[PDB]
Amino acid sequence: GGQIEFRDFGLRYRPELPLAVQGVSFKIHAGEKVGIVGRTGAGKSSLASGLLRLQEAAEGGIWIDGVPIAHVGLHTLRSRISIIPQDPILFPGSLRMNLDLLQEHSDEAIWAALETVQLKALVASLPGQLQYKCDLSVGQKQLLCLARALLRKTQILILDEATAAVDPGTELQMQAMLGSWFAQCTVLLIAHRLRSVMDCARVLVMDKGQVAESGSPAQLLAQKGLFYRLAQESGLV
Ligand SMILES: Nc1ncnc2c1ncn2[C@@H]1O[C@H](COP(=O)(O)OP(=O)(O)O)[C@@H](O)[C@H]1O
């Protein structure tokens, strides 16, 4: 399904530190694409880090399809939950290994995923093709991550926006797929550019470790709240 629910959630990265994020309660419906916006330090990455249970729950809990992730095997928990970082690091070695470390797919199915993210041609161009070792641009590495997210049968796609200048063709293919191959996939897009979540149907606005406001960009723009302030600073409104 990919339906996530934070219920009064907070996490700390280390015992001695204060809660990085606290009292976060929200329900993401299965298959939804929700943008997550906020300033640096607001708590956007912590939500994904709480989902992946990188940091354990300090308060409340998270539930994925009615199952408390607190009671879900970590490998299981993380198997169909995929994250696309800003600057993905290829695991040193075979390209195929990066795409399929567990070797649970056939070269056939891997090439499909690549062609899905429109990297089949690039990969075919590569010196070792699938066996190509690691180069590829940050945008391409993200796409490769997207193809891997497909192979994983991912139902929760956490996407991290590149803080660096966005490749015009990567953005074109990335959006091209989010509504088609990840249509049924829940997509948490953690955005560092407010413009990127404007077409989103729903945005969580993170603020100093707490959910500040929720709803569509139009709703949040009308509220003239933190979301609205970020749009002004961004020059969108
Ligand atoms: N590795 C870390 N160790 C300790 N504190 C952290 C770490 N990463 C983030 N934080 C803190 O937790 C809070 C939440 O930030 P974060 O979740 O990273 O939001 P964002 O994704 O918007 O940067 C911030 O105050 C941040 O400084």
44 is in an annotated binding site: yes
37 φ, ψ to 5°? -125, 155
Q: How far is the CA of 208 from the centre of ligand 1 (A)?
A: 9
C-alpha 27 – ligand 1 centre gap (Å): 22
**Count of positions (residues) in the chain:** 237
Handedness of CA 46, 185, 152, 116 (dihedral sign): negative
The reply, when asked if residue 42 is annotated as ligand binding, is yes
> What strands, in cross-sheet order, belong to the sheet with 67-68?
21-28, 4-11, 59-64, 67-68
**How far apart, in Å, are the Cα atoms of 135 and each of 61, 90, 94?**
40, 10, 13
Strand partners, 185: none
CA distances from 26 to 81, 128, 212 (A): 18, 45, 11
For helices 107-116 and 138-151, the axis angle rounded to 10 degrees is: 130
The CA–CA distances, whole Å, from 30 to 94, 113, 148, 182, 210 equal 34, 22, 20, 11, 23
Best CATH choice for the domain 4-234 from the list 2.40.50.100, 3.40.50.300, 3.40.50.2300, 3.40.190.10: 3.40.50.300
CA of 206, closest atom in ligand 1:
22
Q: Answer for the pair 32, 186: CB distance below 8 angstroms, yes or no.
A: yes
Residue 43's closest CA among 214, 159, 208?
Answer: 208
Mapping DSSP onto H, E and C, the string for the chain reads: CCCEEEEEEEECCCCCCCCCEEEEEEEECCCCEEEEECCCCCCHHHHHHHHCCCCCCCEEEEEECCEEHHHCCHHHHHHCEEEECCCCCCCCCEHHHHHCCCCCCCHHHHHHHHHHCCCHHHHHHCCCHHHCECCCCHHHHHHHHHHHHHHCCCCEEEEECCCCCCCHHHHHHHHHHHCCCCCCCEEEEEECCHHHHCCCCCEEEEECCEEEEEECHHHHHHHCCHHHHHHHHHCCC
Query: Can you give the residue ranges of every domain in the chain?
Result: 4-234
Q: How far apart are CA 17 and CA 193, in angstroms?
A: 28
Residue type, 152: R
Alpha-carbon distance of 209 to 124, in angstroms, equals 44
Q: Per the annotation, does 106 bind a ligand?
A: no
Atom of ligand 1 nearest to the CA of 45: 21
Query: Atom 16, ligand 1: which residue's CA is nearest?
Result: 43
Q: Is 60 annotated as a binding residue?
A: no
Which residues lie with the beta carbon below 6 Å from any ligand 1 atom?
A: 13, 17, 20-21, 38, 40-46, 206, 209
Q: Which residue has the tokens 């945008």?
A: 139
Separation of alpha carbons 29 and 52, rounded Å: 18
Token pair belonging to 120? 């089949």
Task: Report d(CA 117, CA 128) in Å as an integer.
Answer: 19
Distance CA 19, CA 15 (A): 9
Instruction: Please give the Cα distance from 63 to 20 (Å, whole number).
Output: 19
Atom of ligand 1 nearest to the CA of 44: 21
